[PDB]
Every structure is written in C-alpha cells, then in structure tokens.
Amino acid sequence: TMTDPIADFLTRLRNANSAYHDEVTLPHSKLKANIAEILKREGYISDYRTEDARVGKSLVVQLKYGPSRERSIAGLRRVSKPGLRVYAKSTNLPRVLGGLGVAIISTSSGLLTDRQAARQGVGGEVLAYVW
Amino acid sequence: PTIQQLVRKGRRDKIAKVKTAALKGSPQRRGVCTRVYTTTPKKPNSALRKVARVKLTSQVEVTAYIPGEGHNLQEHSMVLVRGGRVKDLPGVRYKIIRGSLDTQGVKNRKQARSRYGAKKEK
C-alpha cells in the first residue's frame, strides 16, 4: 500500500523540480495545505490552489524557476519518518546551512518555521529540512 | 536495515585478534630455553637466523628470535622475553631482550645501545 504521505509530497516536489515542470496536482489534505502556505511564505513556491477531483479534493502547486531556468530549490529531504519519530526539545532546533535553510516544526501553535519556533521558545515534532 | 531489525537483533561487533598470547597481560616473561639453534627464512631472504625454543612460565612453548649477532645462550639458560613481530619467519612472534639475567650485551655496539643492552664507553 502507501504509508508516507509527507514523503510522497516532498518526493513529488523534488521530482517536478527535477523535470522542470511548472505545476503539480496532488490529492488534498489539511496538513499539505499548511505546508504549501508555509512554503509560499518562505518563498519557494509561487502560489498554490485547492481544486477538486472525481471523489476527493486536490491541491495544485505552481513552482518557481529563476529567469535563466535556475531552479529555486536545490534539493530537499524529510526527517521525521514513520518508524523513527524525530522530536525536538527547543534547545536543539536543528539549523540548516549556517541557518540559511528552513525546518518545518509542528508544535502547539501549529506548523512553525525554525526561527519563529525558537523565538516562541516552544517546539515539538519535525517534518522536514528544506533549502 | 530498519531500526526494528537493529532493535530485535543488535549490532554484533568484531573482535580484534589479541596478539601475543603467552605473555598474558605481561609486557615481559621469564624463560628457560630448550633448544638454541639457527633456521633459514623464506626464499627471497637467503640467510640463517638465530632462534630459541623457550618454555615460558605461562606454560607455553614458543619459538623466539635473538637480535644482535652474539649469544652466550644454550640449553637451560634463564632469560627474559618480550614482544615483537618478525616479518621473515613463519610464526615467530617473541624476541629475547638482551641484557637480562643471562644475555650478555654485544661488544663494541656503541650506536643504539639502549635496545641491545650495552654500557656506555668510558
């Protein structure tokens, strides 16, 4: 069957970047919606939208590619997989690339980027490193 | 390997082969030799190296090489043995440290005296 939705999401983004496709369509979820909102805020994607399909809803993402076809995203990889659930005390909020990359923490306040998560002081589960 | 496998079986380490069995946690041992003689190493190194067949006090018989070029050593001699690997010989592992209880220091050796047990020139 399938088991890992977040990894499916990230892999498919990686794949569409790999192919230099312009848009992607996925099945829809509230977690995925928060993810696309956060990524829009941080500036990787241009803009998403929630469309529909035969029985279920759907997310549609529109990527971002530099002017000379410079991909906006180097790579990406999930951290907290099923099996090893990778939690964090706020003392060790993992930075990325001197701090230049981005984490995506899920916390009491919802889905917090690494910086805001540190400022608020609280933290919790990890989902991904991004850069 | 999934973490479930790691949990359920483990990570079985290697073990490094502990060399120098006869000494048994000793740096040196005390020896009373059986035979003192000479034997030739492998085909390229054509020579005739000087060896003894010692009964240490770990109760293990061992072939052991004799450095330098001189020996007052024959049967029954009371000597002291230490560790060191000779390339040339098949299973030789132990050397006799010169200047301990029978082994008289080689003569006119004046460079590198600490290892061969030689007093300094006056």
């Binding site: 941080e42 500036g43 990787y44 971002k64 530099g66 410079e70 906006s72 180097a74 690339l97 001197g98 701090g99 230049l100 | -």
Partner: protein
C-alpha cells in the same frame, strides 16, 4: 602571483610490443590566494612539461568561491565519482584542516579556517573532484534572497551579518591603508 601545487605524480606506462614506454602525469591546482581557484591535470614524459601543461590549464579554468574574511558561509557535502568530502565552516583561529589535496586546494583559495574530512576514495584525483563539487555547490545568501524573493534579513542569520560588515570595514580600511 598565482600559487601553484603538486599533489599527484604518477608514473604511468603504455606498453608496446617492444617494451614499456613510460610516462608521467601531474595534478596542479592554482589559486591567487584570494578566492580564484582552478585545476589542471597535465601529462608528458617530463615532469616540468606535464606540470606546465597543468599550470596553463588551471590558469584557464579558474572558479570563484564564497569566502568570508577567511571562512565560507556554511557546510556542504561534496560527492564525486568515488570521493566524498564534508566541508564545514570554522571560526577564525582554526587553520586549514585537511589532508594534502584539499588542504592545497583551500590554501590556493586562501581559506585559512575551515574543516573537511575524506570519507572514501582516498586518491587525490577524486578527492579534489569531490572538493570542487562541494565548492560549486556552495550558494551565497545574496543569491538565495535574490531567487526566493525575500531579503537577506528573512533569509540569513545575525552572526553572519555581523561578520559581513566586520570583514567589510576591515577590507575598506585595508584598502585605505594600502593605496590611500
């Protein structure tokens, strides 16, 4: 005034029905000591000849590096054909920690305080190529802010910006003592 290196001298030989027609190689890594870095792989019967081939090669084939006073921005993983390296930034006062190859690379580039570590394929050829892959992979915060449309504030931390303006004022005063 360009620093030049020798981190590889191997004695190769084609074989003809007669015998062994010997030969030499050389791997040269050039850098002015300021960030300009290039690599040649010369070869001939004469070691001067091979090394000079590699010299002109690297004089052509330079390459620009994200340097900071004396350290790069951030860590990266450089994987090559067979070699792997883990470049990681140091704090000023560290030294150019590497072996022979990557050390020569980063001393040509003048990075005085940085780390690496060889994780496989110890041969200097592919050590160097993984090193160079890492250096090409280094991305500048200016570039990142530019591409994702957010300022260097939202895109980069505070300690780096401290060091940026610090080394910038140091470089301005350096030029003002040099020329002016």
């Amino acid at each position: 005034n360009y620093i030049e290196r020798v981190v590889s001298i191997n004695r190769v030989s084609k074989v003809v029905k007669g015998g062994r027609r010997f030969s030499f190689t050389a791997l040269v890594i050039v850098g002015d000591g300021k960030g300009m870095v290039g690599v040649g792989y010369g070869k001939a019967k004469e070691v001067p000849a091979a090394i000079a081939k590699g010299v002109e090669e690297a004089r052509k084939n330079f390459f620009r590096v994200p340097l900071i006073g004396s350290t790069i921005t951030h860590p990266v993983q450089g994987e090559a054909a067979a070699g792997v390296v883990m470049l990681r930034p140091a704090s000023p006062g560290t030294g150019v920690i590497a072996g022979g190859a990557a050390r020569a690379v980063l001393e040509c580039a003048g990075v005085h305080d940085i780390l690496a570590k060889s994780l496989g394929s110890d041969n200097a050829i592919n050590v160097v190529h993984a090193t160079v892959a890492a250096l090409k992979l280094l991305q500048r915060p200016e570039e990142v802010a530019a591409r994702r449309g957010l300022p260097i504030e939202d895109v980069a931390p505070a300690g780096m910006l401290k060091a940026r303006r610090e080394s910038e004022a140091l470089a301005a005063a350096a030029a003002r003592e040099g020329s002016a």
